[PDB]
């Protein structure tokens, strides 16, 4: 019924010094049903990254769509597009659907090439944007992240901090709801490189 | 001059004519002479079918539009065909909606107002016939003649189509006479007949070449052709 | 949310808390709830966010463009007009509520806008769930001719009834005043009573503590 | 009526041509010539720029060279903003393309697609062709390197080498009779060079006058990479090749 | 070839014939028109001409009513004259209504002058052969006269004058302010600068005028009125009495 | 919401208590419920707020259109502007009005116009859910051809006991004076009307 | 009625040539001359004034418009075709970029908009060209100050600094002697007063002379205060004074 | 629902599909064949809404044979599957949407590798070793599971299938007539006739 | 050059109209019909040319009705007439509907004037045919209109159009100088039957039928009604009279 409750699934993101990480669980379900251990939340287009939470196929199509339009805005523009920039493009591209909107929790995530500033965004399904100074949470165990975040976190962190703070966050808020797990990525960025971990946890 | 001004019916000439419309007119000229009278209970349409070879038909010129009302015409048939069809639709929707059968008066108002819309704008043309409609309605027997001009007048008779003139003074003269001819159809067709034979000149009005119809008080609007208007030939 | 919209001698201002809710869990701790329609136009939305934002900067957008052509600053009454005829088309359905001020040529003034499209006028007034908890406010303390700063004295403490008052309010107080014969001022955050105390331990982990099962560099550069 | 100021912009002559075609592309023959050359290891495109001025900003100017795709980009010969037209809705089909199969679009599709284009407004809509010529240099896991050219006619053909624009015979004759199938890129970056130079109908050629790209696949990484060339770059290439 | 004088395209010298026709159409009526602005008011007279004695001379105008506040005057044919006016009044109430405030002169001239810009790029609208001239004291920029022609062309004027003899009524005008010093006619009553007009009107046509022979329209804060017969004749009552 | 209009010797005069609400809670008490559509004619609202306010516009709208181009509109013709729009969109709108204007040739007039889209020309009008409760009242105290006072009086009687009973009503009762005099505006406050 | 004139008015001639347009340019030779210099921390526009009367308010008449904050545009030829171009420059702005991205399109960007409207009128049907050259001058975060002449045909070239109309020639001939890339605004601004003077009939005072710049941020012309990253509109449309000011040390 | 299975092994994908075809009270066949190949190395097996099913399955046949024939070349796998997700996902928002479930088998001619993709009405698509649609997967995901490898030869993973569908035909409430299965490969499609009783 | 009167909205060089001009031509060339306003309504009057016996007398009716309180006549092309009425009687219902009250006069006349006036602006549409009177009375007064070809339209004391409109104005500016205060209806029906009378004799080749109307306040109660019987044959006599 819940087109939200579906797939399940969840996204977090965290700014620190100089970076900002964010992180994914990997289940695609049916309902009880787990089906696949390998469905990755987030994707990027340059160096900014989007993790998107909610029903599976909105989930592909708004990823084919912003790839689509970030390559038209970088033949255009002759540069690739920043977090704040891409931010007020995902909620207008949200909001265009107002009456008929896809069932997803995007967050962004990426760092300003120009000013270095750590940058991170969540939207409801409208497109209406909360700009975070520290975090954000995504999907079906969100209440689960915010009690995980709101504690685990502090600012400032390091990005080998920061990449155990947020991964403590996924991983504990993931085991407490039933349609989250079976495997998480995080992602850690900063202004020169991106790194991608893989986390081992229980599968099931 | 002309050359100018003829190449479409949105131009007016130097001296305010419609060519296009006058050369329409002129397809008229070229038809088959058709004639139509009345007296005060009958309305008769008596026209001259033309035969292409003598292994061809004798095309008809008369059509019904409703049981009180019909036309005869003289020009390129396909208009007259869309003319009539036209006012059948406007015959049918008048007693459908209102339960009542279309003013002859009325019906000829419509086929101005049709006919003057090909004359005004860009794209189209007039229409290429020249129309005779007969009717018996609420105030008796009617006679109309329409013009691709969009003009369209009550009379007692007339006629229209080549050498249409013969009739025309003939029933000028003719007119206190046929116009009392009441009660008494096979006179007033016979009148009709003899207006038409004015205007003959190649041949003689044959079986399979005359064509009349009639309308009137109790006479729903019929078509008489062959051995049927072989009384009058 | 709490909003509120209180004129005084020669302007108007407003103000709104800045929580943010999703059912009973705070979203964000610190949203806002005020909008800039142009310079000195400025709005206080309640209702559905998405549609605050976004029935504020379509008749912002519209409003910049009628200012470039006409050559004239923009008049509330203009944006007025946009929002309530835009809203009542959509009947409802965009759920927006918003308190809209400003100064221009004309004055400065003071509407409030439902989502259906109907529109009221008042020296003071409160929209969203801290509503009755604000009004209480107003109504025992607004008087004609208050002072800007009376006024920004109790716009600021109608936002704390519903604050303190209402679980759909909370966090901070940001206020934006439109004096008619100066530049229009967003205070941002003009008010911080809720500062969340020192934690009790750090929980920072440490590194190693997490099991990783592979690694690798993502391509960034194209 | 109207009839009377209609050009009727698309019709046969009594010898069976279409008018506004072969005026368009007598428009295109004063136009900047462009060559596309192609290697065993890459593809080169060169144009010159028709028309310049000292104050002209060349660091900022692009009127010849546009990349279409990360595989595939475009060589102009005629009227820029008609081109740029083409050239939108060239990017938007490639995007498309890659939305509905998650793979970059085969060379000749998107080529196919805008000469179609190009041929509509010469069958119907009464509308003057687009006074353009491209020349397109991309590359894909099915034909590997691709030359193509189109022009207002709608029609399209792949090449080893070729020009458009300007002197385009004595052009053609010139890489005709240089071009070899073993060519390496910039064995072909020198030859477009040479061509170019010998039918200038300018004094010399200057970088100022000159745009140039490349699309090689780096052997030190494996994947296919356009180079649009730096106006710094294009007057150092120039001075290597003996041309100063 | 030749039909580049036909349609609105360009001539080999870059011209449009179409349009500049069109501003020959505006002198047809053979009538002038001028324009002042008061202390507090604007003014704009008009030569009245009724040859016909069938006609109703009350029914003879070409000035309009656009608004409570924008008044327009017009020199061209009447049928092209009401098109305008028509359009004018519509896009005031339309304004209005989409805005919550009166359109303000110079605004309403801008959009009437991209609608004549545009017959003037799109080939099967024909320009209108006049020039309207509107006038009202703009609640921010108080008395205002703007002109538009067919062309698309419209500014705002201290004072002006369209016709036949535009060119002598227009020298007459500058030649008093280049005296004045000052952008308009320091009357504070509309109905001494209404006297001005029809005094500088007489001197530069050099012709007197009876009752008859004027049309007075008069725009104030919130209202656009038109004199009658004898709101003029008691005009040219007090200017004969100082003459 | 109380509203009415009466008129009388010299005009017409139209009234209308200032409340609205959400529920119980009392949105606005203030509220201006005597809307004008032109310069002398004028409205009472009943119904949706949203809903009145849109048609109050878009009448004001065409009479100023009407009026550009033909002069001054009857009342006749406003209350039909009004009808014209409640009767064809009966479906989507929720409008109780009563148009009030004066003429010259006429003098006063007043048109109630309910829900269906209907129009009825009356001596004097009363709607809104306060006017249930005195229908009683006004039918046995309405008089044709008052004077200024008396109607003024008849009115602010009539609407304080609307006000006294209805729940939906209440604030002060605003009036509007319409005569060839010109636009007269009233206000009586609770203090004056409630101990009446 | 209808429009019915849905062929192309602009086509190629056996020569190759596109009449309508190459007509239109001559419009534009016509037309008064303006003109634009890129500095190094700003750009600026100029073009004269010419009152078609002095009973006319110059005032009332901008030929030097803003399009963004950050981007402005001056031209030469068809004053009207000017007009209805900058109303829909202004609003393409908006609907093609403002509304999608939340930020104000880069002078580059919003050029391609507007050479594209001109295109169109060069082979949408019933329609002649725009009879008007423009110089658009504008800043944006990534590709700082920048300069562009677009002409009737939809053509549009990034310049360091040029003229267009009446004396093009001569004026750019003089422009090409004083510039160079070390030019502060002031010195483009004195530049473009010295360059146009010769151009320039009669009065040559800061009444008869339209003059903006495209500088540094004015946080005065903002209108509000209290976010940090709205610091202001870089362009600036100079008064009558600035004018006069700069020309007694011409 | 209907039986919708999918195993990939080494060199190729295998597809096992029931053959009933049930309209409420009668099943009206048992030798249904609910499968469409796209391209010589691509078959498309599908289960859903009465109508839909096959006149979608044919819908996609068609298009991809254009495809083939416009570029004389045939689509990868991937690109297929890409093909049919947006195809689905279109469905999905329109007036009335095409209620099937697919599974696509292809072995990619160039990658020299099997593929499996299921796709659900949703447009939900993601890539396995074995799939199912509908109950299926519920009581043979947990067999599945435990003896699936990577390196299965075709015979392997057929008598894994074998086993699967006898748990099948053992613990559902359903008749569903027995499983015609295809097996896709290098060298095409070709029909296991012999899995009723292999 | 030439040519500027083939198409309908091009403006020859010194600012006219022509297929306008060549209308109005077909206006003259037109039955003459005319109008006279009396102290409390209208009258309306037409020639109407008797080409033989075989046209049934007092039939072809010209004048028409539009709504009820208003009187139309023209003189030109026939259809072009009832074309205009037509889109009359559809603005005048309009009008009622939405307002309530009949149209206005002065409102109907513009509503006329608009549209004919929109037939000169594309050459995709010919001009009106055709000179109309037309009038009635209205909540302020009477009033008597003539609408031209071009769409230009003016309030008339009296009006006159066609073959014999020069005769018909001169007898009415006489009505118009001996009798400042106002002739009456009864009156002007009269003296509308003499002036079609005299007017005759530009076509007095023919043989013809008066048609006369009117709209009075105190005669027909503002609803525009035909003379018919004894009070037409009165005013047929009244001009047989004064004709000799």
């Given at each position: ?21 964010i ?26 990254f ?59 995530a ?16 409208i ?28 600012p400032?962190?390091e990005?080998e ?5 947020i ?6 808020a ?16 900063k ?14 | ?6 190449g ?7 001296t ?49 539009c ?8 003289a ?64 105030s ?14 009550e ?9 249409s ?51 009137g ?17 | ?9 020669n ?55 009628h ?5 004239r600053?923009?008049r ?26 400003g100064?221009d ?56 009834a ?25 205070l ?14 750090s ?9 990783v ?10 | ?41 890459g ?20 009127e ?8 595939i ?5 005629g ?8 050239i ?7 995007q ?56 207002p ?19 053609q ?26 039918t ?20 030190n ?21 003996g041309?100063? | ?28 009526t053979?009538?002038?028109?001028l ?7 604007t003014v704009?007279?008009?030569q ?63 959009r ?9 790029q ?32 419209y ?17 007459n005008?500058?030649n ?10 320091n ?57 | ?72 509109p ?40 309910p ?34 006072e008396?109607?003024v ?9 609307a ?17 060839a ?11 004056e009307?409630?101990?009446? | ?12 001639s ?5 009449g ?49 904050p ?17 109303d ?7 609907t ?22 001109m ?7 019933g ?18 100050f ?51 003077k ?22 005065d012309?903002?209108?509000?205060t ?25 | ?18 053959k ?14 609910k499968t ?8 498309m097996?599908?289960?859903?809404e ?93 067999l ?29 409430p ?7 299965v ?6 095409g ?10 | ?7 309908n ?15 109005v ?39 028409q009705?539009?709504?009820r ?39 109907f ?5 608009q ?33 031209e ?5 003016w309030?008339?004391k009296?009006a006159?159009?066609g ?25 002007a ?8 009378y ?13 048609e ?33």
């Open positions: 019924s819940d087109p939200s409750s579906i797939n399940g699934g969840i996204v977090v993101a965290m700014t620190g010094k100089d970076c900002v990480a992180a994914c669980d990997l289940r695609l379900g049916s309902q009880s049903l787990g089906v696949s251990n390998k469905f990755e939340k987030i994707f990027h287009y340059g160096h900014v989007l993790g998107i939470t909610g029903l599976a196929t909105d989930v592909t199509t708004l990823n084919e769509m912003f790839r689509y339009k970030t390559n038209l805005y970088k033949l255009k523009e002759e540069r690739a597009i920043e977090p704040e920039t891409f931010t007020q493009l995902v909620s207008s591209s949200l909001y265009e659907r107002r009456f008929g909107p896809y069932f997803v929790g995007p967050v962004v990426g760092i300003n090439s120009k000013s270095g500033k750590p940058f991170i965004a969540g939207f409801d399904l497109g209406c944007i909360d700009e975070a100074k520290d975090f954000i949470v995504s999907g079906t165990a969100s209440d689960q992240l915010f009690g995980m975040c709101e504690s685990l976190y502090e400032n962190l990005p901090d920061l990449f155990e703070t991964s403590q966050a996924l991983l504990n993931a085991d407490r709801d039933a349609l989250s797990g079976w495997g998480a990525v995080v992602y850690i960025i202004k020169d490189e991106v790194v991608k971990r893989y986390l081992k946890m229980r599968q099931d | 001059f002309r050359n100018n001004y003829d479409d019916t949105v131009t007016f000439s130097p305010g004519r419609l060519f296009q419309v006058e050369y329409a007119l002129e397809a008229i000229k070229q038809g088959s002479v058709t004639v139509g009278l009345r007296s005060n209970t009958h309305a008769v349409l008596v026209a001259l079918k033309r035969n292409a070879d003598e292994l061809s038909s004798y095309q008809k010129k008369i059509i019904k409703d049981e009180h009302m019909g036309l005869s015409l020009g390129l048939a396909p208009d007259a065909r869309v003319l009539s069809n036209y006012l059948r639709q406007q015959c049918n929707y008048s007693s459908l909606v209102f339960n009542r059968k279309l003013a002859v008066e009325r019906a000829g108002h419509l086929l101005c107002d049709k006919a003057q819309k090909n004359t005004q704008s860009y794209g189209g043309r007039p229409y290429g016939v020249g129309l005779l409609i007969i009717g018996y309605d609420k008796g027997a009617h006679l109309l003649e329409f013009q691709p001009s969009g003009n369209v007048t009379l007692y008779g007339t006629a229209i189509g080549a050498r003139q013969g009739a025309k003074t003939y029933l000028e003269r003719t007119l206190d006479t046929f116009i009392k001819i009441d009660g008494n159809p096979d006179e007033l067709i016979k009148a009709g007949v003899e207006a038409i034979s004015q205007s003959l000149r190649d041949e003689s009005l044959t079986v399979d070449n005359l064509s009349i119809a009639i309308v008080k109790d006479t729903p609007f019929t078509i008489y052709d062959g051995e049927a208007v072989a009384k009058y030939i | 949310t709490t909003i509120v919209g209180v004129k005084f001698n302007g108007v201002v407003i103000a709104a808390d800045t929580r943010s809710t999703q059912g009973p869990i705070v979203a964000d701790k610190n949203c806002a709830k005020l909008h800039r329609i142009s310079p000195k136009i400025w709005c206080a939305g309640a209702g559905t966010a998405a549609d605050t934002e976004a029935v504020t900067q379509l008749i912002g957008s519209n409003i910049e463009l200012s470039l052509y006409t050559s600053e923009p509330v009454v203009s944006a007025l007009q946009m929002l309530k005829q835009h809203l009542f088309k959509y009947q409802g359905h965009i759920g927006a509520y918003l308190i809209v001020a100064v040529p004309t004055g400065s003034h003071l509407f409030s806008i439902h989502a259906h499209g109907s529109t009221d006028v008042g020296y003071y007034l409160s929209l969203g769930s801290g509503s009755l908890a604000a009004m209480a406010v107003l109504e025992s303390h607004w008087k004609q001719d208050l002072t800007k700063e009376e006024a920004i004295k109790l716009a600021s403490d109608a936002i704390q519903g604050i303190w008052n209402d679980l759909g309010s909370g966090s901070n107080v940001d206020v934006c005043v439109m004096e008619i014969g100066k530049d229009a001022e967003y941002r955050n003009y008010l911080t009573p809720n500062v969340r105390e020192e934690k009790q331990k929980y920072k982990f440490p590194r190693g503590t997490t099991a099962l592979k690694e690798s560099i993502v391509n960034i550069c194209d | 009526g109207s009839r009377r100021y209609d050009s009727r912009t698309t019709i046969f002559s009594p010898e069976g041509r279409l008018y506004q075609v072969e005026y368009a592309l007598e428009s295109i023959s004063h136009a900047g010539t462009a060559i596309g050359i192609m290697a065993s290891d593809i080169v495109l060169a144009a010159e720029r028709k028309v310049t001025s000292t104050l002209l900003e060349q660091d900022t100017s692009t010849k060279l546009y990349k279409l795709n990360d595989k980009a475009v060589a102009v010969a009227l820029t903003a008609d081109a740029e037209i083409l939108n809705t060239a990017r938007i089909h490639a498309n393309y890659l939305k509905t199969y998650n793979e970059d679009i085969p060379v000749e599709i998107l080529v196919r697609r805008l000469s179609d284009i190009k041929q509509g407004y010469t069958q119907h809509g009464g509308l003057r062709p687009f006074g353009v010529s491209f020349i397109y240099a991309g590359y894909d896991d099915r034909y590997g390197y691709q030359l193509y050219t189109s022009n006619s709608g029609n399209y053909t792949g090449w080893k080498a070729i020009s458009v624009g300007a002197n385009t015979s004595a052009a004759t010139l890489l005709q009779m240089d071009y070899k199938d073993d060519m390496k890129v910039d064995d072909a970056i020198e030859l477009a060079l040479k061509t170019l130079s010998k200038t109908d300018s004094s010399a050629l200057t970088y100022d006058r000159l745009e140039f790209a490349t699309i090689r696949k780096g052997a990484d494996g994947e296919v990479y356009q180079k649009i060339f730096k106006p710094q770059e294009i007057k150092d290439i120039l001075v290597k090749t041309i100063t | 070839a030749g039909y580049d004088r036909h349609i609105t395209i360009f001539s080999p010298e870059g011209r449009l014939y179409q349009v500049e026709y069109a501003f020959k159409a505006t002198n047809q053979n009538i002038n028109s324009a002042v602005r008061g202390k507090d008011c704009v007279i008009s009245k001409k009724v040859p016909d004695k069938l006609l109703d001379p009350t029914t003879v105008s070409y000035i309009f009513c656009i608004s409570r506040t924008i008044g327009m005057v017009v020199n061209g044919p009447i049928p092209d004259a009401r098109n305008a006016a028509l359009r004018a009044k519509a896009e005031a109430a339309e304004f209005r209504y989409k805005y919550g405030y009166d359109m303000p002169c110079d605004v309403l001239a801008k009437m002058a991209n609608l004549s810009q545009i017959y003037t799109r080939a099967y609208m024909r320009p209108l052969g006049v020039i309207l001239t509107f006038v009202s004291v703009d609640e921010e920029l108080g008395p205002s006269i703007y002109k538009t022609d067919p062309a698309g062309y500014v705002g004027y201290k004072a002006t004058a369209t016709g036949p003899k535009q060119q002598e009524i227009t020298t005008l500058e008093h302010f280049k005296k004045s010093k000052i952008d308009h006619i009357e504070e009553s509309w109905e001494k600068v209404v006297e001005f007009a029809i005094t500088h009107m007489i001197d530069a046509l050099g012709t007197e005028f009876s009752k008859n022979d004027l049309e007075v329209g008069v725009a104030t804060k919130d209202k656009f009125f038109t004199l009658s017969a004898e709101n003029i004749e008691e005009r040219l009552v007090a200017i004969a009495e100082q003459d | 919401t109380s509203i009415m209009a009466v008129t009388f010797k010299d005009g017409v005069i139209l009234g209308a208590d200032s409340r609205t609400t959400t529920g119980a809670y009392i949105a606005n008490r203030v509220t201006d419920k005597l809307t004008r559509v032109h310069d002398k004619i004028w409205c009472c609202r009943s119904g949706s707020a949203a809903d009145t306010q849109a048609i109050a516009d878009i009448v004001q709208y065409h009479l100023e259109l009407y009026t550009s181009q033909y002069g001054t009857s009342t006749e013709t406003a209350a039909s502007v009004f009808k014209e729009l409640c009767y064809e969109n009966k479906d989507n709108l929720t409008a109780g009005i009563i148009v009030a204007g004066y003429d010259d040739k006429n003098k006063g007039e007043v048109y109630t116009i829900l269906g889209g209907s129009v009825h020309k009356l001596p004097y009008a009363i709607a809104g859910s306060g006017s249930t409760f005195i229908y009683g009242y006004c039918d046995k105290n309405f008089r044709e051809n008052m004077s200024k008396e109607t009086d008849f009115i602010k009687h009539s609407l304080s006991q006000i006294k009973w209805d729940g939906s009503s209440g604030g002060v009762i605003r009036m509007v004076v319409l005569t005099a010109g636009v007269e505006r009233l206000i009586f406050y609770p203090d009307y409630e101990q009446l | 009625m209808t429009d019915r004139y849905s062929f192309s008015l602009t086509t190629f056996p020569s190759g040539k596109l309508q347009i190459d007509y239109a340019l001559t419009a534009v030779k016509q037309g008064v001359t303006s003109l634009g210099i890129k500095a190094t921390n700003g750009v600026v526009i100029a073009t004269e004034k010419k009152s078609s009367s002095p009973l006319a308010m110059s005032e009332t008449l901008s030929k030097v418009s803003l399009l963004t950050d981007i402005g545009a001056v031209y030469s030829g068809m004053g009207p075709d000017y007009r209805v171009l900058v829909k420059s202004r609003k393409v702005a908006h093609s970029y403002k509304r999608i991205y939340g930020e104000y399109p880069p002078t580059k960007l919003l050029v391609s908009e507007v050479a594209k409207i295109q169109e009128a060069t082979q949408s049907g329609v002649r060209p725009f009879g008007v050259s423009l110089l658009i001058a504008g800043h944006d975060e990534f590709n700082g920048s300069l562009y002449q677009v002409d009737p045909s939809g053509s549009y070239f990034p310049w360091k600094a040029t003229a267009i109309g009446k004396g093009s020639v001569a004026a750019k001939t003089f422009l090409e002697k004083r510039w160079n890339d070390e030019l502060e605004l002031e010195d483009a601004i004195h530049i473009a007063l010295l360059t146009l010769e151009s320039v009939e009669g009065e040559f005072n800061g009444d008869t002379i339209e003059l903006a710049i495209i500088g540094d941020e004015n946080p012309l903002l209108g509000y209290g976010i940090p990253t709205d610091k202001g509109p870089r362009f600036r449309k100079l008064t009558s004074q600035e004018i006069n000011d700069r020309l007694e040390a011409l | 629902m209907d039986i919708i299975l999918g195993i990939r092994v080494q060199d190729s994908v295998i597809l096992a599909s029931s009933a075809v049930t309209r409420g009270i009668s099943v009206l066949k048992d030798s249904d064949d469409r190949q796209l391209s010589p190395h691509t078959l097996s599908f289960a859903g009465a109508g839909d099913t096959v006149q979608f399955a044919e819908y996609i046949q068609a298009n991809i044979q254009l495809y083939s024939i416009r570029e004389d070349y045939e689509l990868s796998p991937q690109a297929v599957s890409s093909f049919v997700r947006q195809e689905l996902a279109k469905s999905i928002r329109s007036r009335r949407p095409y209620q099937v479930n697919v599974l696509i088998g292809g072995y990619d001619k160039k990658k020299n590798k099997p593929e499996l993709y299921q796709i659900d009405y949703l447009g939900t698509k993601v890539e396995l070793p074995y799939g199912a649609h509908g109950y299926s997967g519920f009581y043979t995901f947990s599945l599971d435990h003896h699936y490898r990577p390196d299965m030869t075709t015979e392997e993973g057929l008598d894994l299938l074998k086993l699967c569908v006898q748990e099948l035909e053992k613990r559902m359903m008749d569903f007539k027995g499983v015609i295809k097996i896709v490969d290098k060298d499609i070709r029909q296991v006739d012999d899995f009723q009783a292999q | 050059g030439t040519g500027y009167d083939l198409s909205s091009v403006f020859s060089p010194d600012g006219r109209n022509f297929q306008v001009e060549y209308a031509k077909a206006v003259e060339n037109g039955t003459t019909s005319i109008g006279i306003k009396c102290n409390d309504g209208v009258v309306f009057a037409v020639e109407k040319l008797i080409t033989s016996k075989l046209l049934v007398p007092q039939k072809n009716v010209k004048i009705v539009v709504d309180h208003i009187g139309c006549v023209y003189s030109g092309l026939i259809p072009d007439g009832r074309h205009l009425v037509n889109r009359g009687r559809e603005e005048a219902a309009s009008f009622k509907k939405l307002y309530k009250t009949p149209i206005p006069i002065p409102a006349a513009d509503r006329l004037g549209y004919v006036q929109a037939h000169t602006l594309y050459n995709s549409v010919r001009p009106f045919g055709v000179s109309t009177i037309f009038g009635g009375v209205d909540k302020n007064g009477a009033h008597l209109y003539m609408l070809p071009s769409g230009s339209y309030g008339y009296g006159a159009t073959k014999g409109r020069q005769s018909a104005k001169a007898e009415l500016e006489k009505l118009v100088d001996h009798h400042p205060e106002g002739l009456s209806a009864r009156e029906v009269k003296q509308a039957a003499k002036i079609i005299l007017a005759h004799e530009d076509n007095k080749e023919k043989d013809f039928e008066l006369i109307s009117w709209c009075s306040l105190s005669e027909t109660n503002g609803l525009h009604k035909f003379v018919k019987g004894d009070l037409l044959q009165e005013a047929i006599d009244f001009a047989q009279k004064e004709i000799n």
